[PDB]
Amino acid sequence: KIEFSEFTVKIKNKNNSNNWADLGDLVVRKEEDGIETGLNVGGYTATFFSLEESEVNNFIKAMTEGGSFKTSLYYGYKDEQSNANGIQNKEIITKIEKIDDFEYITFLGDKIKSGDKVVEYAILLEDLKKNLK
């Protein structure tokens, strides 16, 4: 069923001016149990979030159609509260958006070390489509 191993995708994110700015690479990878994502930005390298097996299919769906999946441990980018120590069992919820009549999966992150100011991220739908499918 599950055809892939490690791949890498660009990931944008709304900037403090609320404007999708190119952020870095999202290294996606498959491990015996679940999935581990990692964020590289030319630098910063770290685990982004990760996932257990039972949420793998919900991930593949969410990351190509839009749904939601449950991370076993989310860290996010350095802005985010969660970056310090992470949180377990975080539900990511994705939907699709056009950026330039070019579709993007687009999901939220974590409160910013602000009161809501939750960060949003976007990856080009096609890229996830072509590795997750």
Identify residue 97 by its one-letter amino acid code. Answer: E
**Cα–Cα distance, 51 to 96 (Å, whole number):** 21
Q: Are 39 and 26 in contact (CB under 8 A)?
A: yes
Query: How far is Cα 126 from Cα 23, in angstroms, rounded to an integer?
Result: 18
Experimental technique used to determine this entry: X-ray
DSSP string, 17-49: TS-EEEEEEEEEEE-SSSEEEEEEE--EEEEEE
Chain centroid offset of residue 1 CA = 22
CA–CA distance, 32 with 121 (Å, rounded to integer) = 26
Domains assigned to the chain: 1-133 (2.30.31.50)
Contact 36, 47 (CB under 8 A): yes
Rg (alpha carbons) of the chain, rounded to whole number? 14
Q: For residues 66 and 132, what is the distance between their CA atoms, to the nearest angstrom?
A: 13
This structure's resolution (angstroms)?
A: 3.2
